[PDB]
Amino acid sequence: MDTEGFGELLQQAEQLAAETEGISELPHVERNLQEIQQAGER
Amino acid sequence: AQIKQLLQNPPAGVDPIIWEQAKVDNPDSEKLIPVPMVGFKELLRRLKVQDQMTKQHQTRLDIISEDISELQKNQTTSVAKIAQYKRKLMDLSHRTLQVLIKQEIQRKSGYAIQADEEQLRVQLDTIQGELNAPTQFKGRLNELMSQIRMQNHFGAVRSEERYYIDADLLREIKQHLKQQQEGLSHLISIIKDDLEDIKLVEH
Amino acid sequence: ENGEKITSLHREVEKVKLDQKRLDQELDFILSQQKELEDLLSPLEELVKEQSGTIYLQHADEEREKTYKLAENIDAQLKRMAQDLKDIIEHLNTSGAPADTSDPLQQICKILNAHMDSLQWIDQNSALLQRKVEEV
Amino acid sequence: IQRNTLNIDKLKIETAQELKNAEIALRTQKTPPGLQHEYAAPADYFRILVQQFEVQLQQYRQQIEELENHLATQANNSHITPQDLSMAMQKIYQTFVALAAQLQSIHENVKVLKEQYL
């Protein structure tokens, strides 16, 4: 179907991890799967 | 009232006990009243209306769709202004600070200046060669950059292959994350309200 | 049954457009605060080259200024560094699966990490609040 | 759009402090001009940016030290998975659930205090 939410989400999250000058908020590295599950557990 | 007005007193030549019962039988009375239907052409009738109806639904749905496209188009390439504004902000902050600073060297010596100043100055000293020196810089930044690249070289190949993969099956797991996203957004806004219902606990 | 949805579609759509409008004209105006606050940091370039000219017709020397010049570079320097650190992180992220970046896979890993991060907050901002309650 | 709202609230908040440290700056030196004095601001705000930065440095080393734990990992880093996605999501649907605990946890806690006040 025609959805545009997670395309927002991914969007957001995309737009998230890249930069910038914002005095504080630096882009974050993305984990996933093996390290993440454990990361979730902690 | 007007409903009440037509539905009773009966219609087209429809029997009064049946017409009654469609009224009781009616599944959904505000949205609906009993309307007499008359054999096949009448169903034909209904269908003609349905189609009539269909086109207009489709269209209005298109109108919502166009307005949403306009909002998204405005929004998606409008990020530009927000980002631009933010950078301009930081540059103006630098100039603000630089002008703020020069108003404290030119009017201010005067050669008065000290007191509080040294404390500023103690903080600044600390932070500055902290940084320097030694330690940090060197070692760390580029064991990391020395390093990163070697991992880049190596990762490429191991790659090679493996062998496709599994991309593919990626569509959804689209979908299920959407639903986790809304749940988290509700919890975050509830925590934020919690502590509201909390500074007020400032009691 | 569909028509109803259509309704709260219309709804909530023109309240989205009440939205954007607004945020739209907002951005003008935050934008105008940026044209004014700028002309006039200078015309604050009078008031500051006057002081200069005046100060020059004085005995002489300038001093204890350097410290500030150091402060601004010092404050400035790390800003330099945050960029570099950003320039690294992106590279690290870049090093990661080939033949298709455009797939859904990475989509799900990004989004999901976004969720995990948000969840984290919710955690101890919550724990905060939960923490905080003790004084009471 | 939603997302776009927090962004302006940030640009709002910020042009406001900068209008102004820009205002502690013009017209202060405007006076000067006639003859007055505005300034030990800075000392305020200068030491305020210091304090500001002081933490940002810690953030830098926090992130740096994460990077290498991460790279470090990446080195271990190198091998198939549909089951795991599931295994992740059944875990997230637990993690969200204890977190909710806590939030109601807190929320009700606040509520209690709020009740006590009146």
Curated annotation (Swiss-Prot), chain A:
Source species, domain of life: Eukaryota
UniProt-annotated location(s): Nucleus membrane; Nucleus, Nuclear pore complex; Nucleus envelope
Function field: Plays a role in the nuclear pore complex (NPC) assembly and/or maintenance. May anchor nucleoporins, but not NUP153 and TPR, to the NPC. During renal development, regulates podocyte migration and proliferation through SMAD4 signaling.
Subunit architecture: Part of the nuclear pore complex (NPC). Component of the p62 complex, a complex composed of NUP62 and NUP54. Forms a complex with NUP35, NUP155, NUP205 and lamin B; the interaction with NUP35 is direct. Does not interact with TPR. Interacts with SMAD4 and IPO7; translocates SMAD4 to the nucleus through the NPC upon BMP7 stimulation resulting in activation of SMAD4 signaling. (Microbial infection) Interacts with SARS-CoV translation inhibitor nsp1; this interaction may disrupt nuclear pore function.
Family classification: Belongs to the nucleoporin interacting component (NIC) family.
UniProt name for this protein: Nuclear pore complex protein Nup93
Origin species: Homo sapiens
Coverage span on the entire protein: 1 to 42 of 819
From Swiss-Prot, chain B:
Outcome reported for the amino acid change (mutating I68S): In DYT37; uncertain significance
Subunit structure and binding partners: Component of the p62 complex, a complex composed of NUP62, NUP54, and the isoform p58 and isoform p45 of NUP58. Interacts with NUTF2.
SS bond list: none
Cell location: Nucleus, Nuclear pore complex; Nucleus membrane
Function field: Component of the nuclear pore complex, a complex required for the trafficking across the nuclear membrane.
Sequence repeat ranges per the UniProt record: 154-155
Name the UniProt record assigns to this protein: Nucleoporin p54
Disease: Dystonia 37, early-onset, with striatal lesions: A form of dystonia, a disorder defined by the presence of sustained involuntary muscle contraction, often leading to abnormal postures. DYT37 is an autosomal recessive form characterized by the onset of progressive dystonia, dysphagia, and choreoathetosis in the first months or years of life. Affected individuals show delayed motor development and may have impaired intellectual development.
Family listed: Belongs to the NUP54 family.
Modifications made to the protein after synthesis: O-glycosylated.
Domain of life from the UniProt record: Eukaryota
Domain comment quoted from the record: Contains FG repeats.
Coiled-coil boundaries: none
UniProtKB/Swiss-Prot annotation, chain C:
Subcellular location: Nucleus, Nuclear pore complex; Cytoplasm, Cytoskeleton, Spindle pole; Nucleus envelope; Cytoplasm, Cytoskeleton, Microtubule organizing center, Centrosome
The record's account of how the chain is modified after translation: O-glycosylated. Contains about 10 N-acetylglucosamine side chain sites predicted for the entire protein, among which only one in the C-terminal.
Ranges for region Required for centrosome localization: 1-92
Phosphoserine: modified positions: S42, S52
Entry coiled-coil feature ranges: 1-92
Glycan-carrying positions: T7, S102
Comment field on protein domains: Contains FG repeats.
Subunit structure: Component of the p62 complex, a complex at least composed of NUP62, NUP54, and NUP58. Interacts with NUP88. Interacts with NUTF2. Interacts with HIKESHI. Interacts with OSBPL8. Interacts with CAPG. Interacts with SAS6 and TUBG1 at the centrosome. Interacts with MCM3AP isoform GANP. (Microbial infection) Interacts with Epstein-barr virus BGLF4; this interaction allows BGLF4 nuclear entry.
Linked pathology: Infantile striatonigral degeneration: Neurological disorder characterized by symmetrical degeneration of the caudate nucleus, putamen, and occasionally the globus pallidus, with little involvement of the rest of the brain. The clinical features include developmental regression, choreoathetosis, dystonia, spasticity, dysphagia, failure to thrive, nystagmus, optic atrophy, and intellectual disability.
Similarity comment text for this entry: Belongs to the nucleoporin NSP1/NUP62 family.
Record's protein name: Nuclear pore glycoprotein p62
Parent sequence residues shown: 367 to 502 of 522
UniProtKB/Swiss-Prot annotation, chain D:
Protein name as it appears in the record: Nucleoporin p58/p45
Coiled coil (residue ranges): 14-81
Modification comment: O-glycosylated.
Region of the whole protein represented: 301 to 418 of 599
Written domain comment of the UniProt record: Contains FG repeats. FG repeats are interaction sites for karyopherins (importins, exportins) and form probably an affinity gradient, guiding the transport proteins unidirectionally with their cargo through the NPC. FG repeat regions are highly flexible and lack ordered secondary structure. The overall conservation of FG repeats regarding exact sequence, spacing, and repeat unit length is limited.
Organism superkingdom: Eukaryota
The protein's role, per its UniProt record: Component of the nuclear pore complex, a complex required for the trafficking across the nuclear membrane.
Record gene name: NUP58
Quaternary data: Component of the p62 complex, a complex at least composed of NUP62, NUP54, and NUP58. Interacts with NUTF2. Interacts with SRP1-alpha and Importin p97 proteins when they are together, but not with SRP1-alpha protein alone.
